[PDB]
């Protein structure tokens, strides 16, 4: 067993050790709340509780490939409102940038498309955008698959014109991953390689409520420590009919057999602060936030 004790202090004791060379960051929507962007499943503030005006039979419809193909207007409506684009990466995003600078970051797997991992200074090679990107767009026909650049989507969304392939006249959507779609190839190729050599899973701002991304915690070695920094406990529950996770594929924080998994409950910003400090990196993180935020105001 690699953790001297199931607390934040014993994770930072582990990170200082020789034995901790390669960290995989698994992140979700809660790393981007403190920078102004609401998540999906939080009650009342979550996007899923704020789609009434589309009179959707249920909220996940707006990001489902079959609902989309029949009623594409709801989604295109949201996508403009989705992207004001005036958002700064949080403390939590820089912490991952620090991991990069410390030679500690094997990868960050993100469920977000708000692009703040990239604006925080992680590179395309440090990053798997698990759930796609707005950067490019494609025709939804499997035989055509025509690609259109950021501008071409941008210009049809604020036209208020439902985008349509020039070649086949089918719907064109941004390369965000909808329910029913494939995840990009980079996800599997990186996965099969990355999880063979991982020493710490750091899991931030996610409810682990979708597959395949919720599988990732089960892919690390049985002895790899797994720290959650989240408002609630995520990945830990009694089985039920319709659970998302595999049998015994989840976190064990609290049971008598618990050995390697730690939950820190609270703000993603403050945990990252409290780990940095333990690790003696407080000022270094604060200074890089202060600088990088000044640097954006000015550009
Ligand atoms: N500041 C905060 N600090 C810590 N945790 C936070 C904070 N704010 C929110 N949380 C927690 O952060 C978590 C947010 O969970 P969810 O909103 O489901 O986001 P996803 O990223 O998992 O959604 C995954 C996919 O589902 C979608 O369809 C798309 O396809 C997404 O890509 C909760 O447990 C919050 O308590
Ligand atoms: O909207 C849907 C939905 O909510 C559920 C579902 C999931 C878990 C549960 O516990 C439950 O009661 C329902 O399944 C679905 C299956 C589909 O093929 C299409 C859908 O649109 C839904
Ligand atoms: Zn086409």
Numbering used by the authors: 57 to 355
Tell me, in the authors' exact words, what the paper reports.
Sirtuins feature differing substrate acyl selectivities.
Quercetin caused a concentration-dependent inhibition of all Sirtuin isoforms except for Sirt6, which was instead activated. To identify the alternative quercetin binding site and modulation mechanism, we determined a crystal structure of a Sirt2/quercetin complex at 2.2 Å resolution. An overlay with a Sirt2/substrate peptide complex reveals that quercetin partly occupies the pocket accommodating substrate moieties C-terminal from the acetyl-Lys and thus sterically prevents substrate binding. Comparing the Sirt2/quercetin complex to other Sirtuin isoforms reveals that its binding site is also accessible in Sirt1, 3, and 5, whereas it is occupied in Sirt6 by the N-terminus.
